[PDB]
C-alpha cells in the first residue's frame, strides 16, 4: 500500500509574534513538500525532485491553502485556551494529520483527519469516515459543531476523491524513487555476555520500503518471545535499517538462523554467525 499524508503543526509563542505554522507532505513516509511560516518567503516548497514538474498553478494553489490553514489554526489555538480555561501567556500546540492509504490497485484503504492539542488526542475521524471520536469535554463541543456542519461528509470527499487521485499522480511522476525496492543486506554480530552467554544481533541495512520481517529461528520455530529488536529506522540516505537480537549458549551459535523477508528479495535470506 501507499499513503499521502499531511502533518500540520501550529505552535504558539506569545510575545514573539504569531504561532509558528508548518505543513509537511509525505508520500509513503518520505517528504515531498513543506510550508513554514518562518521561511523568508513563506510558500509551499518542493522537497523532492519529482514534485518540481508541477505547474505554477499548483504552487500558488497550495500556498494559498496553507495560508488559509494558518488562519484557521490561529483561531483554533485561541478557541482552545477558552475551552480549557488556559492563560493566553503560555505556548501551546495543535497538530493535525490528514491523508489516505491506497491499495496497489488504487482503492482507498483508510482515510485520516485527526487533531491533538498539547500532544494529547483532541478529535479524530473514525475509519467509517462518518463519525468523530472526541477525547474530552472540550472536544465534545467541537464534535457537536462538526456534526451539525456536515464536516465529516466534506472531509470524506477530500479523503476519497482528491487525496486518492493526487496520490496516484505522485506515485507515477515519482515512480523511480517511490516504487523502487532496495533489498536488505544482512549480517550477524556476536557479543559474549558476562553471564557466560552470547548475544547474536541480526542487522538488516540498506532496504526500501520500510516494511520488513526480521526473525530468529532455532530448529524451524521462531523465537518471538525472547527477541530484542529496534523499530525500523531511517539511515540518512532514504533507506531504512533494523536489527533483532537473541541470547544463545556458547557453542550453539550455529543452530540459530536469522530470517529476513522484503519485497526486494526474490527469496528470504537466511544467515548464521
Amino acid at each position: 500500500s501507499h499513503s499521502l499524508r499531511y502533518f500540520v503543526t501550529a505552535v504558539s509563542r506569545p510575545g514573539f509574534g504569531e504561532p509558528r505554522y508548518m505543513e509537511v507532505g509525505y508520500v509513503d513516509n518520505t517528504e515531498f513538500v513543506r510550508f513554514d511560516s518562518d521561511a523568508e518567503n513563506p510558500r509551499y516548497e518542493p522537497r523532492a525532485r519529482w514534485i518540481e514538474q508541477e505547474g505554477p498553478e499548483y504552487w500558488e494553489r497550495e500556498t494559498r491553502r496553507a495560508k488559509g490553514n494558518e488562519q484557521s489554526f490561529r483561531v483554533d489555538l485561541r478557541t482552545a485556551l477558552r475551552y480549557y480555561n488556559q492563560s493566553a501567556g503560555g505556548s501551546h500546540t495543535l497538530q493535525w494529520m490528514a491523508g489516505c492509504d491506497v491499495e496497489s490497485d488504487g482503492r482507498l484503504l483508510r482515510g485520516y483527519w485527526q487533531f491533538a492539542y498539547d500532544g494529547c488526542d483532541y478529535i479524530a475521524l473514525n475509519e467509517d469516515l462518518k463519525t468523530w471520536t472526541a477525547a474530552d469535554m472540550a472536544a465534545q463541543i467541537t464534535r457537536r459543531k462538526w456534526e451539525q456542519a456536515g464536516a465529516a461528509e466534506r472531509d470524506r470527499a477530500y479523503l476519497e476523491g482528491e487525496c486518492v487521485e493526487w496520490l496516484r499522480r505522485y506515485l507515477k511522476n515519482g515512480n523511480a524513487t517511490l516504487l523502487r525496492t532496495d533489498p536488505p543486506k544482512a549480517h550477524v554480530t556476536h557479543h559474549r555476555r558476562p553471564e557466560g552467554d552470547v548475544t547474536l544481533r541480526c542487522w538488516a541495512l540498506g532496504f526500501y520500503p520500510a516494511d520488513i520481517t526480521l526473525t530468529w529461528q532455532l530448529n524451524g520455530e521462531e523465537l518471538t518471545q525472547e527477541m530484542e529488536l529496534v523499530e525500523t529506522r531511517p539511515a540518512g540516505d532514504g533507506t531504512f535499517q533494523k536489527w533483532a537480537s537473541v541470547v544463545v549458549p556458547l557453542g550453539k551459535e550455529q543452530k540459530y538462523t536469522c530470517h529476513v523477508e522484503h519485497e526486494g528479495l526474490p527469496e528470504p535470506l537466511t544467515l548464521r554467525w
Binding site: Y6, E23, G25, V33, Y58, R61, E62, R65, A66, G68, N69, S72, F73, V75, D76, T79, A80, Y83, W96, A98, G99, W113, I141, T142, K145, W146, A149, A151, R154, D155, Y158, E162, C163, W166
Partner: peptide, 9 residues
C-alpha cells in the same frame, strides 16, 4: 495536494 480547514473548533 493537501487538505483545507473549513470548520472551526
Amino acid at each position: 495536494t493537501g487538505a483545507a480547514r473549513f470548520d472551526e473548533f
